[PDB]
Amino acid sequence: MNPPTFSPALLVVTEGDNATFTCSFSNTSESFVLNWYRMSPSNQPDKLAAFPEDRSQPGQDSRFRVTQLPNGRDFHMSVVRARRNDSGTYLCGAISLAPKVQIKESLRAELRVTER
How far is 9 from 3, CA to CA, in rounded Å?
15
Q: Which of residues 73-112 bind Cl ion (CB under 5 A)?
A: 106-107
Q: Per rule CB under 5 A, is residue 72 in the interface with Cl ion?
A: no
Minimum CB distance to Cl ion, residue 84 (Å): 25
Using DSSP bridges, classify how beta strands 74-79 and 19-24 pair: parallel, antiparallel or unpaired.
Answer: antiparallel
Give the dihedral sign, CA 86/87/89/92: positive
Query: Is residue 6 a contact point for Cl ion (CB under 5 A)?
Result: yes
Determine the 3-state secondary structure of 85 from DSSP: helix
In whole angstroms, how close is the CB of 60 to Cl ion at the nearest point?
14
> Which residue's CB is nearer to Cl ion, number 82 or number 106?
106
User: Where on the chain is the footprint of Cl ion (CB under 5 A)?
Assistant: 5-6, 52-53, 106-107
